[model samples]
Target: AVIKEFMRFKVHMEGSMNGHEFEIEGEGEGRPYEGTQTAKLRVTKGGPLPFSWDILSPQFSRAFTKHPADIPDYWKQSFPEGFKWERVMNFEDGGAVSVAQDTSLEDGTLIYKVKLRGTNFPPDGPVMQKKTMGWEASTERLYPEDVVLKGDIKMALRLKDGGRYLADFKTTYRAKKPVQMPGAFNIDRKLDITSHNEDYTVVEQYERSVARHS
Candidate 1:
């Protein structure tokens, strides 16, 4: 039985330096509403998915590797002396963007029609990669009115057996809030709003930090 695995990779940030979760470079948005951050999740055997969710900075990759309790605290201690938990992200928007696919004979390629939306600080530009803040506000959280970049991508993933997986990417941003610094976040409130850098909020942050003391 030949199985094809669809993989997703992303790097994201929030608004301001302490703002909140905004969209990044994936298919969903992670927002901190009350006190939590959530991403919709659903398994799809065929067709589009039924749910979507925001995978916290390191939580996503951690869970993907099957470890949930794993925590990285040094970045905090080494930073401001101690780890400071600020306003965490608490929401996930979207069940599924719009998706339509068809089998192509030209090369057995799967053609898809997709339209995914998310919220972020970087305004839509003519590029797939952009850096943004978390506080960029929008009339519609999914579409900011302040400074958000709209990204629309049509990608074709080629498989080894003989097929291709197509996807459209979008991103959301999140923040640690109240982040004051000479740190990843600037002390300037009106200027900082993202949750901390992935190194602090995310686990195995270095991918090779080799946790030696904690």
Candidate 2:
């Protein structure tokens, strides 16, 4: 099977709060694989803030084959392998913190964990932050003959510094049918978000995915 696809595009995202600014920009091939992304963050304190601290990541990029089985194993010349987006927040008297993260895949499951800590702040920031987050996910296929292509994700973020507070966020998503219908396939998703940070809890929901008809 062969097809023509969208080969170029540009995307960007940005936001600011409590005197902090963060943004991301990306551009490159947009289908069945290849692209580059870069992001930067700035933090400041005091009136008319001019910005002080900053964190910037290198331009990240990825290349791909339509099939995961085509990836090569390094050093052995063996074959194999497999594989989103976007945001941020703020606090009034925030302390400078560093974060450490780890991710690994096992069989059909993926796992990731992160820790945040700072010296001027209590050592408990790491443990407190850990207990403040939650995650749940599932994967499956639409049909036995179809590629494994459906999933769901759920996350909870809690603020443990004072009053009992928490927020839950989640989304349901699935890939478009791979077979051509005179069309190229992509993602279809629905999102739900809730928070209790601004004195009272509030929930917001939205959808952002392509639509198709037959």
Considering every candidate listed, which one attains the maximal TM-score? 2
- Full-model lDDT for every candidate: 0.22, 0.23
Model 1 Cα lDDT, one tens digit per residue, 1-214: 0101222223232222112223322221221111112222221222121112222222221111111124222122122121211122222222122211111111211111122233331322211122211221111112221222122223332333444334343432211222222111101111111333332221221111111111
**Residues 1-214, model 2: lDDT tens digits:** 1111222323232323222444433333323221111212121212122221111111111111132233221101111121121111122224333333222223322222223223232234422233232111211111212322222222222333433222121212111223211122222222222222221112121212222221
Evaluate model 2: give its TM-score. 0.23
Best candidate (score: lDDT)? 2
Model 1: residue 57 alpha-carbon error in angstroms:
14
How many clashes does each candidate structure show, in the order listed? 51, 0
| Model 1 accuracy (lDDT, Cα) | 0.22
